[PDB]
Amino acid sequence: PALKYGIVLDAGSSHTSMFVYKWPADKENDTGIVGQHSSCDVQGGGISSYANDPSKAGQSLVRCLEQALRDVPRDRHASTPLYLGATAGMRLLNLTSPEATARVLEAVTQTLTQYPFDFRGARILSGQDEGVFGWVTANYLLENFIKYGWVGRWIRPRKGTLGAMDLGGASTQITFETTSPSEDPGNEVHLRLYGQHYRVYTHSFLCYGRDQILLRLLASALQIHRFHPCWPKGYSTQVLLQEVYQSPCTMGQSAIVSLSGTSNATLCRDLVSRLFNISSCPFSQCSFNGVFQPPVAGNFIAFSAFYYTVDFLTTVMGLPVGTLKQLEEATEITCNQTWTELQARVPGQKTRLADYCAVAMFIHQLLSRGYHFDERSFREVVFQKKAADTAVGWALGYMLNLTNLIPADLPGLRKGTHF
């Protein structure tokens, strides 16, 4: 009946989103109890985009914080924790300039401390944090941490958990429960949740988020082709080369150049393939780029840009994506469309329309060549962005952790009945 609230600002690479959560005060330690109350998307770029004008990073938040004042009851403002967590955009800016990164964190801090909420800090999450907290969000919301059965008849094996795949703008994470031995400590995660131990694998591929992959494909196309095979025939734009090569993701790869699309699904496939280095593995088994990965297993939820890209293929292109072969065929069809043909399918705003080919190709290869899903394991992947009226991402897991809302053990160890 009486509710408590908490707020997370997800400071992502392309933009900031605010989530307000609520829960009953006298059931707050039950799994699946916390749920989303409201949300707000901050106008303009991510906080890292203000690296040279850090004051604007704090000001960017004001409109959404004003909404938070209206969404959370007044008498609760003071006891509502507020967190900001920043991900790969700020990790990348920290490589370029720790000083600029610090000024941006200082600016958002200054703004947030002016509000009546219990501000608990602005922090940059690690890649492991980001992966693990998204896995917690999904499994918390779907009540996978409940111990199913009853005395004398507990289900065995215990309830499975949902793997998580998150495609952000500047990194992508894969996280799942595994029985495989750990071969790299950087990928090894151990959780104690509701008296149960979960052995988890996680990895974050920095520079493999949607926006950085598009930049890297553009840089590659400029070098190899001087046309862009992933872009549709009839689409062209003036490319500012400074913007192409300024990222840590592309600096490894004449002020302005014209670049035109060619709708070449096969050349687009070849361009995307160059993103995955499969030449070496110092472990028993790898994903790509020499990174340890055990075999994928269990159900998975693919959210964020995986969901938005696949939704374009099914809803706008009207193509099935149920199998890896179907996803590949949909991508080929989409890439082979001319700019007029693509525009004919989208009566409204056309931002990002020239990018779905490249992003769909990337996703198909990431899953199939990168993570080594096959038809059998892919059948167990679902593309969804919401569970139990709450957006799926790392924000909820993060809040749950920092607010100590998930118990490591059940009260009084449930008298030992789960032993």
Curated annotation (Swiss-Prot):
The active site is at E130 (proton acceptor). Belongs to the GDA1/CD39 NTPase family. Its EC number is 3.6.1.-. One of its GO terms (molecular function) is nucleoside diphosphate phosphatase activity. Its cofactor is Ca(2+); Mg(2+). In the nervous system, could hydrolyze ATP and other nucleotides to regulate purinergic neurotransmission. Hydrolyzes ADP only to a marginal extent. It comes from the Eukaryota. This is Ectonucleoside triphosphate diphosphohydrolase 2. It comes from Rattus norvegicus. Residues 1-419 are extracellular. GO terms for biological process: cellular response to interferon-alpha; cellular response to interleukin-6; cellular response to lipopolysaccharide; cellular response to tumor necrosis factor; G protein-coupled receptor signaling pathway; nucleoside diphosphate catabolic process; platelet activation; purine ribonucleoside diphosphate catabolic process. The gene is Entpd2.
